[PDB]
Amino acid sequence: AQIGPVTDLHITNANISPDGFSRPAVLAGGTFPGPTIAGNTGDNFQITVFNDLTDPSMLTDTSIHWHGLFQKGTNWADGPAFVTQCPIITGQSFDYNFNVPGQAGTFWYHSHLSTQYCDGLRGPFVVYDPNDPNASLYDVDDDTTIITLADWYHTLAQQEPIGAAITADATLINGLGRSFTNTTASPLSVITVQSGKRYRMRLVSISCDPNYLFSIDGHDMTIIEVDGVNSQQLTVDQIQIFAAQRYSFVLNANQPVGNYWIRAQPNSGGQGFDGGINSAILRYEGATVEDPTTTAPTTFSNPLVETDLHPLADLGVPGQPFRGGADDPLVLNLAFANGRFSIDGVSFVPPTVPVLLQILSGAQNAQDLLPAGSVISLPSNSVIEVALPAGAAGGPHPFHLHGHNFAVVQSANNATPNYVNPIWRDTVSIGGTGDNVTIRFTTNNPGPWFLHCHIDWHLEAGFAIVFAEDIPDTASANPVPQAWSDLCPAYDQAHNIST
Numbered sequence: 001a002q003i004g005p006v007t008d009l010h011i012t013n014a015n016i017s018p019d020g021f022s023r024p025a026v027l028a029g030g031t032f033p034g035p036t037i038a039g040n041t042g043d044n045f046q047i048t049v050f051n052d053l054t055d056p057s058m059l060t061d062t063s064i065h066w067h068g069l070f071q072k073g074t075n076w077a078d079g080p081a082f083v084t085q086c087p088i089i090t091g092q093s094f095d096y097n098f099n100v101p102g103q104a105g106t107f108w109y110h111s112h113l114s115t116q117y118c119d120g121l122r123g124p125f126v127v128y129d130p131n132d133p134n135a136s137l138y139d140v141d142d143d144t145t146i147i148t149l150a151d152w153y154h155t156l157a158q159q160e161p162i163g164a165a166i167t168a169d170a171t172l173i174n175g176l177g178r179s180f181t182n183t184t185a186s187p188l189s190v191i192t193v194q195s196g197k198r199y200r201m202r203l204v205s206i207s208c209d210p211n212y213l214f215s216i217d218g219h220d221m222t223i224i225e226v227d228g229v230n231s232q233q234l235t236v237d238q239i240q241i242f243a244a245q246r247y248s249f250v251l252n253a254n255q256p257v258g259n260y261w262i263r264a265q266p267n268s269g270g271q272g273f274d275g276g277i278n279s280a281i282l283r284y285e286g287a288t289v290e291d292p293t294t295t296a297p298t299t300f301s302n303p304l305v306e307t308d309l310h311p312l313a314d315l316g317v318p319g320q321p322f323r324g325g326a327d328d329p330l331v332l333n334l335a336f337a338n339g340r341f342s343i344d345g346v347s348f349v350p351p352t353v354p355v356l357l358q359i360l361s362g363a364q365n366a367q368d369l370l371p372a373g374s375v376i377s378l379p380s381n382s383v384i385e386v387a388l389p390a391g392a393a394g395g396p397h398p399f400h401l402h403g404h405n406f407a408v409v410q411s412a413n414n415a416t417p418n419y420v421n422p423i424w425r426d427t428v429s430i431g432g433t434g435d436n437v438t439i440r441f442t443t444n445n446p447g448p449w450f451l452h453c454h455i456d457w458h459l460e461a462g463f464a465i466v467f468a469e470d471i472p473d474t475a476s477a478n479p480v481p482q483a484w485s486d487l488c489p490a491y492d493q494a495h496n497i498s499t
């Protein structure tokens with residue numbers, strides 16, 4: 001069952017074996033992935049998070065981010081540790097009380113403390129639209145049509161060297177899959193469809209690192225949503241999905257009744273499908289209960305290319321139709337050396353006092369804010385352009401901005417910008433050497449918004465900056481509840497920190 005929009009959510013430690021290998025984890029709602037949190041557009045969500053963690057090897061503090069939800073007027077509820085709050089300590093709880101005006105689509109939630117989400121705290125978050133403009137394109141859209149793609153590690157996250165190329169031990173599809181080494185024939189996930197029906201499949205990358213080449217043997221996929229943004233229909237036979245991205249696609253159950261492989265090939269870790277790694281099963285009602293016998297093609301003739309995507313609504317692009325054609329045009333210098341990433345020469349290390357709390361206490365320019373050199377102020381009611389030229393090791397890097405979606409004016413592997421009708425999204429691959437992936441948005445949401453690579457190992461190694469958007473209006477726009485004001489005193493007391 002789905003939970004929400006008003007619900008408790010307990011965060012616990014437990015042993016799990018999603019690929020046949022037992023390890024302890026950090027779980028929401030007792031499962032991997034966590035339960036789907038759901039509501040309708042414009043609803044009030046009140047997710048009271050109970051921190052019941054006791055195993056220090058995965059951290060006993062926590063904080064949860066609602067990925068892709070704008071949090072307008074509720075910056076304090078966004079979740080990134082030391083940007084918008086101090087962590088929740090064990091034995092305490094915290095009500096994330098916010099609203100979702102003007103958004104409807106496929107989202108997710110995850111820990112936003114250190115690399116803790118890798119240890120299991122990840123789940124889907126769906127905001128349905130009772131008047132969805134795409135409603136007539138499918139018959140079925142429910143918890144059974146969500147497809148999560150996850151990397152899974154046998155080593156605990158706090159034992160992963162910082163700045164290292166860290167590699168997974170299994171791909172999990174809807175929580176199940178097989179290990180790349182010492183492979184055992186542990187259970188695979190089954191997605192069941194009825195011949196003749198059309199399904200809104202909500203594809204969610206909950207990855208900590210790899211991107212996946214996703215396909216379904218015998219089937220194609222008609223994309224209708226990208227990171228919460230409705231798209232024109234685009235039919236493809238393969239989707240390369242980067243960490244934290246989402247797509248809705250229509251699956252037409254129009255092939256013969258039978259069993260078909262679902263494939264998710266990561267860019268690192270096990271290559272291919274031997275022993276049923278990187279796999280799940282699409283089963284038609286009435287098919288024999290047996291593994292598929294289907295083949296992938298040698299090459300995919302209609303793969304997703306990001307520049308083929310266009311919004312369903314006339315969203316356009318803010319600013320003027322040339323590079324630098326914005327009120328505040330930025331170019332970030334994105335680098336890696338010696339185990340640490342940097343942005344504009346500064347490696348991100350979380351501050352002792354969360355950025356939002358520094359601003360509420362009166363610090364009002366970005367040079368007064370800590371960490372020094374890690375906070376860039378943005379002016380209010382302005383068009384922002386951010387060029388993100390690739391080349392830093394460990395690519396391709398999927399960059400994500402909190403508090404906003406953005407027009408993708410230039411995409412990976414294509415030097416031509418699009419100032420007319422590019423897709424809008426919230427997480428974007430910045431591509432490869434020589435690319436100049438560029439995003440635009442307008443500043444109508446006061447508060448500190450994190451910008452970072454969504455490969456969680458890279459964020460931990462410093463690949464982040466904070467956009468302090470409209471510092472002067474942050475306090476008036478974001479009144480804070482007493483329980484939020486209580487978090488840093490409680491956290492610092494528990495950890496013997498002076499502030």
Ligand SMILES: *[C@@H]1O[C@H](CO)[C@@H](O[C@@H]2O[C@H](CO)[C@@H](O[C@@H]3O[C@H](CO)[C@@H](O)[C@H](O)[C@@H]3O)[C@H](O)[C@H]2NC(C)=O)[C@H](O)[C@H]1NC(C)=O
Pocket residue numbers: 323324331387389434435436438
């Ligand atoms: C990606 O696109 C951005 C623009 O969105 C390019 O930024 C431009 O970068 C050049 C240098 O590479 C800048 O010109 C330089 O400016 C300094 C003065 O600030 C001057 O001393 C240098 O001699 C040179 O003129 C320019 O200001 C900047 N913005 C623009 C043109 O709008 C960036 O180069 C692109 N990166 C890649 C890898 O393609």
Ligand SMILES: *[C@@H]1O[C@H](CO)[C@@H](O[C@@H]2O[C@H](CO)[C@@H](O[C@@H]3O[C@H](CO)[C@@H](O)[C@H](O)[C@@H]3O)[C@H](O)[C@H]2NC(C)=O)[C@H](O)[C@H]1NC(C)=O
Pocket residue numbers: 305307414415416417418419
């Ligand atoms: C590389 O990225 C560029 C920019 O996003 C892509 O260029 C765009 O290509 C589309 C599709 O061909 C062009 O739209 C076409 O326009 C004609 C004339 O209106 C229309 O009849 C077609 O039905 C279609 O709408 C679009 O104008 C063009 N934009 C720009 C700025 O060049 C390009 O396709 C990408 N390259 C690859 C290999 O995908």
Ligand SMILES: [Cu+2]
Pocket residue numbers: 065067110244400454
């Ligand atoms: Cu996220």
Ligand SMILES: [Cu+2]
Pocket residue numbers: 065066067068400401402403
């Ligand atoms: Cu986010």
Ligand SMILES: [Cu+2]
Pocket residue numbers: 394395396397398453454455458459463
């Ligand atoms: Cu990265």
Ligand SMILES: [Cu+2]
Pocket residue numbers: 065080112400402450452
């Ligand atoms: Cu984030």
Ligand code: NA
Pocket residue numbers: 316317318319
């Ligand atoms: Na425009």
